[PDB]
Amino acid sequence: DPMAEKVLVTGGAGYIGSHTVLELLEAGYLPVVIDNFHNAFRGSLPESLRRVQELTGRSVEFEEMDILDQGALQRLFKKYSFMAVIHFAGLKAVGESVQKPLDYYRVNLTGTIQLLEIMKAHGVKNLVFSSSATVYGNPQYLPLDEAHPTGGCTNPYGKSKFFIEEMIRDLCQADKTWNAVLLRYFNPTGAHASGCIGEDPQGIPNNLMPYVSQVAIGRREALNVFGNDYDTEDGTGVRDYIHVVDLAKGHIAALRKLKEQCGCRIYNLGTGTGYSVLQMVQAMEKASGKKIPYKVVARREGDVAACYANPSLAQEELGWTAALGLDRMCEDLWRWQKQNPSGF
Amino acid sequence: DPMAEKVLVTGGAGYIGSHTVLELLEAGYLPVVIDNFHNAFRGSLPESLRRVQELTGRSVEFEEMDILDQGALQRLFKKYSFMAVIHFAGLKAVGESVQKPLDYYRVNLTGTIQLLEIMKAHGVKNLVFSSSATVYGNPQYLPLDEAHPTGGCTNPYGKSKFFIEEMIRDLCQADKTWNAVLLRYFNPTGAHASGCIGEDPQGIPNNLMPYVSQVAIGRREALNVFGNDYDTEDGTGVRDYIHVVDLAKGHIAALRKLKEQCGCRIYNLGTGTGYSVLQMVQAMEKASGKKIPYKVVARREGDVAACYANPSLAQEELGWTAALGLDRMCEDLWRWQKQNPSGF
Numbered sequence: 209d210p211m212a213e214k215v216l217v218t219g220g221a222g223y224i225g226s227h228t229v230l231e232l233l234e235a236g237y238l239p240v241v242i243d244n245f246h247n248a249f250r251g252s253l254p255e256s257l258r259r260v261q262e263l264t265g266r267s268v269e270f271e272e273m274d275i276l277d278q279g280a281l282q283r284l285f286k287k288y289s290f291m292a293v294i295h296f297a298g299l300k301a302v303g304e305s306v307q308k309p310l311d312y313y314r315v316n317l318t319g320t321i322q323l324l325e326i327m328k329a330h331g332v333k334n335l336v337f338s339s340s341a342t343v344y345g346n347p348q349y350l351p352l353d354e355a356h357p358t359g360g361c362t363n364p365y366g367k368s369k370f371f372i373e374e375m376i377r378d379l380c381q382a383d384k385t386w387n388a389v390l391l392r393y394f395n396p397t398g399a400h401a402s403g404c405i406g407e408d409p410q411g412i413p414n415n416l417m418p419y420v421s422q423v424a425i426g427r428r429e430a431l432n433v434f435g436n437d438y439d440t441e442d443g444t445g446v447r448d449y450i451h452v453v454d455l456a457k458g459h460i461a462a463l464r465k466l467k468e469q470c471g472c473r474i475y476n477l478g479t480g481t482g483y484s485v486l487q488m489v490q491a492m493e494k495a496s497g498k499k500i501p502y503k504v505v506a507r508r509e510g511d512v513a514a515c516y517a518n519p520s521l522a523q524e525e526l527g528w529t530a531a532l533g534l535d536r537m538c539e540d541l542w543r544w545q546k547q548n549p550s551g552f
Numbered sequence: 553d554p555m556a557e558k559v560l561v562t563g564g565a566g567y568i569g570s571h572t573v574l575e576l577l578e579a580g581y582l583p584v585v586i587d588n589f590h591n592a593f594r595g596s597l598p599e600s601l602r603r604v605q606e607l608t609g610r611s612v613e614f615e616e617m618d619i620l621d622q623g624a625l626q627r628l629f630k631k632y633s634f635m636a637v638i639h640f641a642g643l644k645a646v647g648e649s650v651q652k653p654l655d656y657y658r659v660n661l662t663g664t665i666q667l668l669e670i671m672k673a674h675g676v677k678n679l680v681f682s683s684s685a686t687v688y689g690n691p692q693y694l695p696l697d698e699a700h701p702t703g704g705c706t707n708p709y710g711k712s713k714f715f716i717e718e719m720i721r722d723l724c725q726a727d728k729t730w731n732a733v734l735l736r737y738f739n740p741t742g743a744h745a746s747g748c749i750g751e752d753p754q755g756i757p758n759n760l761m762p763y764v765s766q767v768a769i770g771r772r773e774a775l776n777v778f779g780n781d782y783d784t785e786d787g788t789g790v791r792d793y794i795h796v797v798d799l800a801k802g803h804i805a806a807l808r809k810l811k812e813q814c815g816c817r818i819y820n821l822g823t824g825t826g827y828s829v830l831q832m833v834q835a836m837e838k839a840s841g842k843k844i845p846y847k848v849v850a851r852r853e854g855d856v857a858a859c860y861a862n863p864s865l866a867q868e869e870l871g872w873t874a875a876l877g878l879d880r881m882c883e884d885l886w887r888w889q890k891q892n893p894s895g896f
């Protein structure tokens with residue numbers, strides 16, 4: 209029966225993936241997760257997923273494997289009957305990608321190509337790709353909508369995400385039976401409201417929310433603020449943050465869209481309101497009850513004043529809206545950090 | 553001794569590669585060719601290379617293998633001592649790429665990544681990449697120089713070439729010991745002056761020179777000309793053609809540049825003069841002695857009036873200039889077709 213078929217979640221042990229697994233379970237889907245533990249903590253599940261099982265009271269099927277392992281992909285697609293794939297597996301630290309680009313291109317490009325090939329072979333032509341709004345590059349107008357130019361980005365991670373988008377678009381053009389939804393978003397933050405799962409400490413973080421929470425808890429003295437004279441409401445730079453639970457629900461919405469036999473579709477996910485650095489400091493002070501000192505330092509050459517996405521098309525075509533604002537992001541991040549100071 | 557080391561030529565059995573192998577031999581280099589016969593004719597060499605050996609009186613080392621075969625790349629780099637790699641192996645039919653994009657991305661992207669990884673592992677950080685001037689997309693100004701924007705192209709082949717350029721650029725940024733020369737050019741034509749090698753008949757040709765020669769020899773009735781009211785000297789569209797022998801010598805020049813420990817460098821190769829469709833017809837009439845009827849049909853939406861490259865930087869930094877003009881291109885193509893009507 210179609211509703212007894214499974215959803216494959218690649219990279220499902222990680223931050224966004226584990227929250228998406230929880231939302232899938234809560235929504236009545238049956239997830240199968242694959243992950244190679246490159247960036248996830250190790251019972252017989254990844255800890256994140258062990259905790260998702262406890263939070264939901266429902267079972268998570270899991271296989272430890274690498275998307276680069278063709279034989280493992282073949283065994284997986286023979287063992288399970290997948291209705292669709294939600295693809296999070298990849299390398300994603302922007303700063304790391306500059307130092308080890310070939311790893312990024314190998315995992316992200318070759319891994320995705322191998323996934324697409326096994327999906328094609330097994331007739332599972334239904335993909336949710338977790339993309340990045342960095343594909344828009346520097347804003348030419350704001351808010352960024354799906355018509356904005358893509359391909360500007362100069363770091364290897366962002367390029368890899370753009371290249372994957374293009375490969376999927378070209379695949380869909382060549383085979384109209386494929387359905388794919390590409391979800392573009394900026395910085396995921398927050399955590400499940402239980403505080404029992406969240407983002408494990410990362411080696412090279414992509415955004416400042418972990419740093420602000422670490423100043424608040426006392427592990428760092430102050431937040432450096434790069435520039436306070438931007439043409440913004442408060443002079444600090446404005447960036448786009450989405451609560452991981454809203455993000456995860458957007459991935460479920462994309463999964464539903466595949467059933468419409470939509471072909472290739474592209475949607476921004478976000479709240480539609482950018483946040484300044486000072487607004488984020490102030491929100492985390494309110495959530496944590498602690499002073500968060502900052503230090504204004506010089507602008508970094510190349511940083512833009514403001515960057516955020518227009519999520520209107522997702523509301524119109526996925527029925528999706530973000531329900532969780534900056535205060536909830538801060539409150540939920542703070543709870544996860546307080547309950548799990550070194551993560552899992 | 554350094555001059556006893558070898559030059560690896562991937563895809564060296566094909567059209568540009570075989571001519572480059574001949575130029576390497578004539579210049580005193582020692583080539584090792586790999587090719588999987590995807591698009592080359594099968595003695596114990598590919599026929600093109602069997603003929604290159606006869607033309608030069610010198611030996612070509614050859615291994616039949618696929619750049620996607622990691623074990624074969626490992627065996628190859630252990631068996632031979634390479635000073636550098638000239639990389640032609642890939643899929644290259646623009647029209648085919650629209651129909652089977654995933655093959656293009658797999659061979660071109662994953663194959664190149666695997667080549668770069670084995671080169672890194674074996675300390676052979678010296679690459680000539682045979683790129684495509686289609687990376688410039690539609691001209692924003694003419695002639696196209698290396699400062700022109702790249703990334704505009706909308707077909708999967710052109711995208712794959714741009715993505716490979718970017719991966720190599722990012723690799724060089726991350727490891728300053730790499731040297732790479734990316735050579736951008738448009739349409740190779742002509743043949744070695746012996747007429748004993750040339751381009752075998754292709755399934756979906758990228759340019760009209762084979763079609764014009766086929767009208768001349770009588771296998772087709774007329775050349776369709778898409779538009780005769782462009783803002784050009786004669787109203788027909790202007791495009792960029794380079795004689796394959798000049799092109800091959802440019803690849804040798806790039807090989808020499810690697811010895812300067814140049815890092816990443818990018819050069820256009822071409823004559824610097826675009827040719828109109830009618831000029832090409834008229835040149836092939838003169839070379840063949842035959843009437844070449846044409847039929848003016850409507851413009852194709854999207855076709856630009858004129859496209860050609862500025863090869864000045866290659867003259868300044870490689871010492872390279874094209875010596876062979878349109879008449880030689882036509883004469884040499886015609887000789888190859890007359891001596892080898894169905895190719896090898």
Ligand SMILES: NC(=O)C1=CN([C@@H]2O[C@H](COP(=O)(O)OP(=O)(O)OC[C@H]3O[C@@H](n4cnc5c(N)ncnc54)[C@H](O)[C@@H]3O)[C@@H](O)[C@H]2O)C=CC1
Nearest residue numbers: 219221222223224243244245246247248274275296297298
């Ligand atoms: N965190 C961010 O700032 C953003 C993330 N994304 C996208 O979200 C996805 C997941 O991101 P996060 O949850 O943030 O990171 P994450 O690193 O927590 O999750 C990724 C998971 O993929 C697994 N993985 C990595 N390579 C693998 C391979 N070769 N085979 C199998 N599993 C593999 C990792 O172990 C990890 O559990 C990636 O596609 C990423 O590009 C998009 C935009 C922003």
Ligand SMILES: NC(=O)C1=CN([C@@H]2O[C@H](COP(=O)(O)OP(=O)(O)OC[C@H]3O[C@@H](n4cnc5c(N)ncnc54)[C@H](O)[C@@H]3O)[C@@H](O)[C@H]2O)C=CC1
Nearest residue numbers: 563565566567568587588589590591592618619640641642
């Ligand atoms: N012909 C054109 O219009 C242009 C070609 N190029 C570039 O030149 C290169 C060679 O082009 P041509 O000589 O024109 O084509 P070609 O098809 O004659 O030569 C390519 C060779 O690569 C071999 N090959 C393909 N996939 C392989 C694999 N997986 N492993 C090993 N060998 C493989 C083929 O069998 C063939 O002998 C490609 O990089 C191409 O993108 C660049 C611009 C224009």
Ligand SMILES: *S(=O)(=O)c1cccc(CNC(=O)Nc2cc(C3CCC3)on2)c1
Nearest residue numbers: 416419430431432433434445446485511
């Ligand atoms: S710590 O204070 O020394 C330290 C060092 C490096 C980075 C951080 C995190 N701080 C920020 O990321 N601040 C920040 C980002 C921006 C964007 C908006 C305009 C650019 O502005 N300030 C902390």
Ligand SMILES: *S(=O)(=O)c1cccc(CNC(=O)Nc2cc(C3CCC3)on2)c1
Nearest residue numbers: 760763774775776777778789790829855
């Ligand atoms: S055959 O005459 O039927 C036939 C069918 C398809 C393609 C051809 C080759 N002819 C051309 O490629 N002509 C051509 C190309 C251009 C460019 C410059 C402006 C676009 O213009 N005419 C033959």
